[PDB]
Amino acid sequence: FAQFGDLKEVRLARNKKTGNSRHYGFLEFVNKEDAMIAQESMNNYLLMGHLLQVR
Amino acid sequence: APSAKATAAKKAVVKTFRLPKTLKLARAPKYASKAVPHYNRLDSYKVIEQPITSET
């Protein structure tokens, strides 16, 4: 996501017991326009195993 | 501002004439039209038809 622009904060939801991730997370951009552009460009971008979902 | 870096990332995600001297093949027929060659039309003997014996 840094390719689109500067990223302020990024966090991932991981299980409390095991270190593996929950396959979902959140991140924030320094600009709302960049964030919405990234969401539009990755709204239904296909990825290995499953299509990525961003809102 | 649109953060032109984001625009570039979005673009990357989305994305006198004359008859040219062409090669010409030379004739190579599978067969000769008159394979049997013709003999000399005008040989040395046929060049001279008859002697002239005029007194002049």
Q: Confirm or reject contact between B32 and chain A (CB < 8 A).
A: no
Q: Measure Cα distances from A18 to A11, A12, A31, B34 in Å.
A: 17, 14, 34, 93
- Which residue is associated with the tokens 């709204």? A43
Asked if B6 and A4 count as a contact pair (C-beta separation under 8 A), the reply is: yes
Cross-chain Cβ contact B14/A4 below 8 Å = no
Resolution expressed in Å? 3.9
Give the minimum alpha-carbon distance from A36 to chain B in angstroms, rounded to a whole number.
10
Q: Confirm or reject contact between B1 and chain A (CB < 8 A).
A: yes
The residue of chain B with its CA nearest to that of A40 is B10
Q: Is A7 exposed, middle or buried (0-12, 13-18, 19+ CB in 10 A)?
A: middle
Which residues, at least 6 apart from A28, have a Cβ–Cβ distance to it below 8 Å?
Answer: A7, A8, A9, A10, A35
Give the minimum alpha-carbon distance from B6 to chain A in angstroms, rounded to a whole number.
4
